[PDB]
């Protein structure tokens, strides 16, 4: 929870029939993003965003 | 003796080939994939050999054992040659027991494997 | 062949005839042709290459008097399947298994080319519809893979469609699942030979195609027997 | 085969295959010590096949109007049409149906490669009904093939429509062995494809669809099947009837 | 002069009045407003030229009136089934798993959005 | 040398030509969709970063967010941004580096490995979105403690035009820096809420997008250029190998024919 | 050609001669050479390929009487303009007229490609 | 040509072209049943040209200073200079003016591809 | 080309030079189609160095003086060995390629490098 992440979840109610919902709306919604923490070469496991 | 230490060495070198081709098209990969990329690069270096310098089996088995079991992964690539002859000379003077036994019995008992593991790891920490 | 024929006709029974290697009949013939005063034919083969082969092969046939199942190893010059010799051999067979260097070089034994091996018996009227369909999808899956390897070459995996990523990943599995330890091949593997019942092969691949085994890692399909063995090995590497 | 041709009748001859004939001719020639040439064929091997294939013909009314029709077969090696005999024969005939291993494994059987096949006679040899619905078909698969490699995301509404339609016509054109279809069974399948009535159905079902659509057409619209078969043409009322029978089947 | 902007679309780039949803007080920025910075909650934004009033439903963001009297509005976003997604948040209330660390935030705005 | 050698090494280049050409048009459509996603990002910058221009906000340990992508085959996108971050990191060697995209993590891991504390994966497939932007920005705040550095810098590539791009840097100002800016008073902000705190977390997310959208469009215009030049050069090899083939094919046939003629004299 | 020559030589006409196809004349000549026992030249073609071509082509020309002008369909094997057949044929061509499916499909009759058809004149 | 060379004068000879001569010579050779070699040319096709182009010379003042100069023409196929007949004459002559289809197409005529063109002795002969 | 005859140093240097050139030659298909920018930086570095050695092997001949337009340099074996050894150690990476072209030993590259800058 943080003002960016907080407006985002609000940007997914207003984003989630399938009418006023073009292709890039359900692609604004999907993220293939995995954050990997790093220390001294890598350190811990890669998690979904 | 040589069969035992060179387990799937040829098949692993095959794995090493396919990988260094997946590396070519520009990508940093994961641990296991870069681990076999490190091992096979050194096993190759281990198999390099001066002309008119044929090696005895009891000299060959140690170098291979050392290679396949990871004990070379810690060593910088451009130093594998000097590792070989030093390691050889270390065994001739100190662990002559083993090289005499390998040359004699032709096979490797677990007693010669444990001794070799204890020997190699010892030399690795110069 | 003359001995095999006598069993066929006068033992009136089922003979096996194993010939290794029938190319040598064509080659040997070739080696005296010029000295018999013949102008050479294409590739330096004898002008009579085919009729010579016809005269031999046609005798190696099941008849109404008896049965001969023949198995012939066939050398392929310089790997060239279009060499007149292998070429002329193809149409004399009911079933061709093509061993392939590129497949053996991947460490997949037997080095069978699963698209370039053919049989008359692959036919719903003979194998039953289910067996037939599995075989076909298996071949579409592998051909789709074979096709996409050109795009896997320059861009790598991550430009493939979702449908295709799945097809490719299922093909890589199926590829390894077609390998098998032979009993006769033990000395080269250390692996006991697995002999897999036909009905289990069908049922196994059926399942792989449907996706029942997609979470199972790729190396658990290599050098094993029937599906039960895949499950067994996947537990080993889980430890 | 010529007895038929020569007596006001019609016969099809299949030479399976002319590669192997060429080979025996060559064997004779070398053994009789006649001068060899390219690939060791005698320098009259082309005359061997053109002597033979020019005998297929449609005769004039004055001479019975009989005909012989030839489907020669040629085996290629690694798709090398440039090889001596394939070259001779390809130049002698009126077109090729060219078949490919790759299309086959893909599941496209008959493994006909359309972009490489031709009938030099073409549309004049074709039931008018089929020429009508499939005149465009010629076009699209051609367009499909250009845009083909795009099958792998971010595409036009133009280039994806091309993709959707092509994929389906390619699937329509698959067939099982030993099951050739009547002309009145083909045109409605191809009217359906060509004119967009398949773009909704998923590619897995274009099989079961063809099966179900024909049987339905048999149960209910035996009328137009008959007219297609009997007139061989499609009047304006007929396309409109076909359109009606198709749209009614799709929605169900 | 008004500057309404979104990251995906760009809405407004001459304007008499604009009504925005601020900290709570829906503010009517008149034609000569004293420079402000206010965060926009989720809600409707009404731009007023003549007597035309174009509403817009908004994810949120920030409004600022400048020294040059220009208004700058930014939002991420400018409905399907009413009850859907709301029941996909009540069942995952949740509990002690760090799932509730966000899933309890859905119901704060879905009774505000449906209020319009 | 042989027909088989030439036939299989021509074929593969005929594919690369067809391939690199397909991704010149693939990343042409992808440019139209990413010029509209760029403009909507750049237009939104003037409106958001204007407040700071008027409030006259300036700076007073450093977090460096570097943005390229995961993909290669795009000219020198990754190479000349890594080149920028290095000339910058030369002045300030004691900074924490966060990477977005693997091709910049590797460029940087080989040069200053221990400065990198976070990496972002799977980044340049579709266009960038506020959701990726904000969820990257959220972890930034969480795991890097974004809110606390004296200085935060986004490195990215600006598309100058279609045919080129410029490696660029931008600052992000924290809450403290916003509040204590020379001309902050010009605005009547209600000092009850944490307008600066929110203004910072919003601008972290928002200007990252601004950066990602441009870098991404810079890339899409380097990719359809590298592939354009690839097809143009792959076709040059197909000219060499078409001719050599038409040669080696004739030579093969002539030499088999000499063999046949010799064998036919005797 | 002999028929076409007489109209030139006795009638003073500018005469057209269509040879369709000129490639098949090369092939036929190739076949005869093989049958007469001559050692094939490069690629199977006769060793007399050029003179055979010469013997025909050189008769198509302008005389003080008039001219034979020949239009000859040319087939290119494997599209290999270097195969001795077209290579030898091209040495004798003064102009080309290239009809195209590309010009046809646009609706242009005749379907001449105006950027592909070239003339030495 | 030699007459001029032999009588203290200067003749320029243009062989247009030696490609076709070599083709004529192959015909002659094959009809005579000589072993066909590279591209079915006979063993002695290098020699055919060599003895020809060697008759170009500048003579010493002790012989009357007369000079024969040869500009033979060879026709490559699709720009390939490694063909048998191109490389033979290139290894007889004192240089090549190589003219290029790619340049000629564009307008750069003479299409003298400079990189791939050389004079080997004409250095001394250039007007200062 | 054996350490017994030429000296271990000579051999080592020759081999490392052959190694370098080879790695460039193994990468030609990719350099040509996709260019330098799609190489890894290790290779990009070894390539950049082969390119220099490649040029550094060109030499003005005394009889070729009319085609190069350059006094024909003649370089002693010991000098060659000492010059290439250094280029391998990466001492002259800052130097543009064209400086190594058509010169003698190591000092001549330095001479050309100063000549070209301004």
Curated annotation (Swiss-Prot), chain B:
The keyword Nucleotide-binding applies. It is found in: Mitochondrion inner membrane. The keyword Nucleotide-binding applies. GO terms for cellular component: cytosol; mitochondrial inner membrane; mitochondrial intermembrane space; mitochondrial nucleoid; mitochondrion; proton-transporting ATP synthase complex. Keywords: ATP synthesis, ATP-binding, CF(1), Hydrogen ion transport, Ion transport, Membrane, Mitochondrion, Mitochondrion inner membrane, Nucleotide-binding, Phosphoprotein, Transit peptide, Transport. GO terms for molecular function: ADP binding; ATP binding; proton-transporting ATP synthase activity, rotational mechanism. GO terms for biological process: proton motive force-driven ATP synthesis. Mitochondrial membrane ATP synthase (F(1)F(0) ATP synthase or Complex V) produces ATP from ADP in the presence of a proton gradient across the membrane which is generated by electron transport complexes of the respiratory chain. F-type ATPases consist of two structural domains, F(1) - containing the extramembraneous catalytic core, and F(0) - containing the membrane proton channel, linked together by a central stalk and a peripheral stalk. During catalysis, ATP synthesis in the catalytic domain of F(1) is coupled via a rotary mechanism of the central stalk subunits to proton translocation. Belongs to the ATPase alpha/beta chains family. Present with 41500 molecules/cell in log phase SD medium. This is ATP synthase subunit alpha, mitochondrial.
From Swiss-Prot, chain C:
Coiled coil: none annotated. It is found in: Mitochondrion; Mitochondrion inner membrane. Disulfide bonds: none annotated. The modification Phosphoserine is found at residue 104. Belongs to the ATPase alpha/beta chains family. Mitochondrial membrane ATP synthase (F(1)F(0) ATP synthase or Complex V) produces ATP from ADP in the presence of a proton gradient across the membrane which is generated by electron transport complexes of the respiratory chain. F-type ATPases consist of two structural domains, F(1) - containing the extramembraneous catalytic core, and F(0) - containing the membrane proton channel, linked together by a central stalk and a peripheral stalk. During catalysis, ATP synthesis in the catalytic domain of F(1) is coupled via a rotary mechanism of the central stalk subunits to proton translocation. Present with 164000 molecules/cell in log phase SD medium. F-type ATPases have 2 components, CF(1) - the catalytic core - and CF(0) - the membrane proton channel. CF(1) has five subunits: alpha(3), beta(3), gamma(1), delta(1), epsilon(1). CF(0) has three main subunits: a, b and c. This is ATP synthase subunit beta, mitochondrial. It comes from Saccharomyces cerevisiae (strain ATCC 204508 / S288c).
From Swiss-Prot, chain D:
It is found in: Mitochondrion inner membrane. Mitochondrial membrane ATP synthase (F(1)F(0) ATP synthase or Complex V) produces ATP from ADP in the presence of a proton gradient across the membrane which is generated by electron transport complexes of the respiratory chain. F-type ATPases consist of two structural domains, F(1) - containing the extramembraneous catalytic core, and F(0) - containing the membrane proton channel, linked together by a central stalk and a peripheral stalk. During catalysis, ATP synthesis in the catalytic domain of F(1) is coupled via a rotary mechanism of the central stalk subunits to proton translocation. Belongs to the ATPase alpha/beta chains family. Changing residue 1 to D: In ATP1-2; growth-defect. The record marks 117 as: Required for activity. F-type ATPases have 2 components, CF(1) - the catalytic core - and CF(0) - the membrane proton channel. CF(1) has five subunits: alpha(3), beta(3), gamma(1), delta(1), epsilon(1). CF(0) has three main subunits: a, b and c. It comes from the Eukaryota. This is ATP synthase subunit alpha, mitochondrial. Present with 41500 molecules/cell in log phase SD medium.
From Swiss-Prot, chain F:
It is a peripheral membrane protein. Changing residue 230 to V: Lower activity. SUPFAM superfamilies: ATP synthase (F1-ATPase), gamma subunit. Its main location: mitochondrion. It is found in: Mitochondrion; Mitochondrion inner membrane. GO terms for cellular component: mitochondrial inner membrane; mitochondrion; proton-transporting ATP synthase complex. One of its GO terms (biological process) is proton motive force-driven ATP synthesis. Signal peptide: none annotated. Changing residue 260 to T: In ATP3-1; dominant suppressor of the slow-growth phenotype of yme1 strains lacking mitochondrial DNA. It comes from the Eukaryota. Pfam families: ATP-synt. One of its GO terms (molecular function) is proton-transporting ATP synthase activity, rotational mechanism. Keywords: ATP synthesis, CF(1), Hydrogen ion transport, Ion transport, Membrane, Mitochondrion, Mitochondrion inner membrane, Transit peptide, Transport. Gene3D superfamilies: 3.40.1380.10. The keyword Membrane applies. Mitochondrial membrane ATP synthase (F(1)F(0) ATP synthase or Complex V) produces ATP from ADP in the presence of a proton gradient across the membrane which is generated by electron transport complexes of the respiratory chain. F-type ATPases consist of two structural domains, F(1) - containing the extramembraneous catalytic core, and F(0) - containing the membrane proton channel, linked together by a central stalk and a peripheral stalk. During catalysis, ATP synthesis in the catalytic domain of F(1) is coupled via a rotary mechanism of the central stalk subunits to proton translocation. Belongs to the ATPase gamma chain family.
């Amino acid at each position: 929870i943080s003002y960016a992440a907080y407006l985002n979840v609000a940007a997914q109610a207003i984003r989630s029939k399938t009418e006023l919902q073009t292709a890039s709306v359900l692609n604004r919604s999907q993220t293939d993003a995995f954050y990997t923490q790093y220390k001294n070469a890598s350190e811990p496991t890669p998690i979904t965003k | 003796a040589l069969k035992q230490v060179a387990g799937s060495l040829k098949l692993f070198l095959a794995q090493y080939r396919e990988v260094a081709a997946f590396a070519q098209f520009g990508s940093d990969l994961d641990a296991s994939t870069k681990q076999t990329l490190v091992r096979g690069e050194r096993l190759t270096q281990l198999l390099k050999q001066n002309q008119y310098s044929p090696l005895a089996t009891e000299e060959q088995v140690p170098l291979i054992y050392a290679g396949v079991n990871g004990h070379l992964d810690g060593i910088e690539l451009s130093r594998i040659g000097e590792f070989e002859s030093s390691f050889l000379s270390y065994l001739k003077s100190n662990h002559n027991e083993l090289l005499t036994e390998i040359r004699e019995k032709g096979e490797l008992s677990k007693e010669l494997l444990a001794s070799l593991k204890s020997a190699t790891e010892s030399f690795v920490a110069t | 062949l003359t001995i095999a024929e006598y069993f066929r006709d006068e033992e009136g029974q089922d003979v096996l005839l194993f010939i290794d290697n029938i190319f040598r009949f064509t080659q040997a013939g070739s080696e005296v042709s010029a000295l018999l005063g013949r102008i050479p034919s294409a590739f330096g083969y004898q002008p009579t290459l085919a009729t010579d082969m016809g005269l031999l092969q046609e005798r190696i046939t099941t008849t109404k008097k008896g049965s001969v199942t023949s198995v012939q190893a066939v050398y392929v010059p310089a790997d060239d399947l279009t060499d007149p010799a292998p070429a002329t051999t193809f149409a004399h067979l009911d079933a061709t298994t093509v061993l392939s260097r590129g497949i053996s070089e991947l460490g997949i034994y037997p080095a069978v080319d699963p698209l370039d091996s053919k049989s008359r018996l692959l036919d719903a009227a003979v194998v039953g519809q289910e067996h037939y369909d599995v075989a076909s999808k298996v071949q579409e899956t592998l051909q789709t893979y074979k096709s996409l390897q050109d795009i896997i070459a320059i861009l790598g995996m991550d430009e493939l469609s979702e449908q295709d990523k799945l097809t490719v990943e299922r093909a890589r599995k199926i590829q390894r699942f077609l390998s098998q330890p032979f009993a006769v091949a033990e000395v080269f593997t250390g692996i006991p030979g697995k002999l897999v019942r036909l009905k289990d092969t069908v049922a196994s691949f059926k399942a792989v195609l449907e996706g029942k085994y997609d979470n199972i890692p790729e190396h658990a399909f290599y050098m094993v027997g029937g599906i039960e063995d895949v499950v067994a090995k996947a537990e080993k590497l889980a430890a | 085969g010529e007895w038929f041709r020569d007596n006001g009748k019609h016969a099809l001859i299949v030479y399976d295959d002319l590669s192997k004939q060429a080979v025996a001719y060559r064997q004779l020639s070398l053994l009789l010590r006649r001068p060899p040439g390219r690939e060791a064929y005698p320098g009259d091997v082309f005359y061997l096949h053109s002597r033979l294939l020019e005998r297929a013909a449609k005769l004039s009314e004055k001479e019975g109007s009989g005909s012989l029709t030839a489907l020669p077969v040629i085996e290629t090696q690694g798709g090398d049409v440039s090889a001596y005999i394939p070259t001779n024969v390809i130049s002698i005939t009126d077109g090729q149906i060219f078949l490919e291993a790759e299309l086959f494994y893909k599941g496209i059987r008959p493994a006909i490669n359309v972009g490489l096949s031709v009938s030099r006679v073409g549309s004049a040899a074709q039931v008018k009904a089929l020429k009508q619905v499939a005149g465009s078909l010629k076009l699209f698969l051609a367009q499909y093939r250009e845009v083909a490699a795009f099958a792998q995301s971010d595409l036009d509404a133009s280039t994806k429509q091309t993709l959707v339609r092509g994929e389906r016509l390619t699937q329509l054109l698959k067939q099982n062995q030993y099951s050739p279809l009547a002309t009145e069974e083909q045109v409605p399948l191809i009217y359906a494809g060509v004119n967009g009535h398949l773009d909704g159905i998923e590619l897995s079902r274009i099989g079961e669809f063809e099966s179900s659509f024909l049987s339905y057409l048999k149960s209910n619209h035996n009328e137009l099947l008959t007219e297609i078969r009997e007139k061989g043409e499609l009047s304006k009322e007929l396309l409109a009837s076909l359109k009606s029978a198709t749209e009614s089947f799709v929605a169900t | 002069k008004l500057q309404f902007a979104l990251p995906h679309e760009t809405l407004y780039s001459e304007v008499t009045q604009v009504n925005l949803p601020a900290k709570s007080g829906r503010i009517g920025v008149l034609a000569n407003h004293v420079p402000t910075v206010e965060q926009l909650l989720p809600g409707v934004v009404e731009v007023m030229e003549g007597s035309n009033s174009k509403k817009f439903f908004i994810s949120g963001g920030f409004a600022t009136v400048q020294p040059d009297s220009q208004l700058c509005v930014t939002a991420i976003e400018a409905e399907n089934i009413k009850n859907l997604l709301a029941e996909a948040k009540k069942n995952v209330s949740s509990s002690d798993a760090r799932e509730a660390a966000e899933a309890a935030i859905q119901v704060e705005v879905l009774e505000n959005l449906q209020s319009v | 040398a042989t027909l088989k050698e030439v036939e299989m090494r021509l074929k593969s280049i005929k594919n690369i030509e067809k391939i690199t050409k397909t991704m010149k048009i693939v990343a042409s459509t992808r440019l139209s969709k990413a010029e509209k996603a760029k403009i909507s990002a750049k237009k939104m910058d003037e409106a958001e970063q204007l407040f700071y221009k008027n409030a006259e906000t300036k700076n007073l340990k450093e977090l460096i967010v570097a943005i390229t992508s995961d993909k290669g085959l795009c000219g020198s996108i990754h190479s000349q941004l890594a080149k920028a971050v290095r000339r910058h990191l030369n002045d300030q060697p004691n900074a924490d580096i966060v990477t977005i995209g693997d091709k910049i993590k590797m460029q940087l891991l080989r040069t200053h490995p221990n400065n990198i504390k976070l990496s972002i994966n799977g980044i340049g497939k579709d266009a960038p979105t506020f959701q990726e932007s904000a969820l990257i920005a959220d972890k930034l705040l969480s795991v890097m403690k974004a809110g606390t550095y004296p200085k935060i810098s986004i490195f990215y590539n600006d598309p100058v035009s279609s045919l080129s791009f410029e490696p660029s840097e931008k600052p992000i100002f924290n809450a403290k820096t916003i509040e204590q800016s020379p001309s902050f008073g010009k605005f009547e902000i209600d000092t009850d809420a944490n307008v600066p705190r929110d203004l910072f977390e919003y601008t972290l997310a928002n200007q990252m997008l601004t950066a990602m959208a441009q870098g991404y469009a810079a890339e899409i215009s380097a990719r359809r250029n590298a592939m354009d030049n690839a097809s143009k050069n792959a076709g040059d090899m197909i000219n060499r190998y078409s001719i050599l083939y038409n040669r080696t094919r004739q030579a093969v046939i002539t030499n088999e024919l000499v063999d046949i003629i010799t064998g036919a004299s005797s």
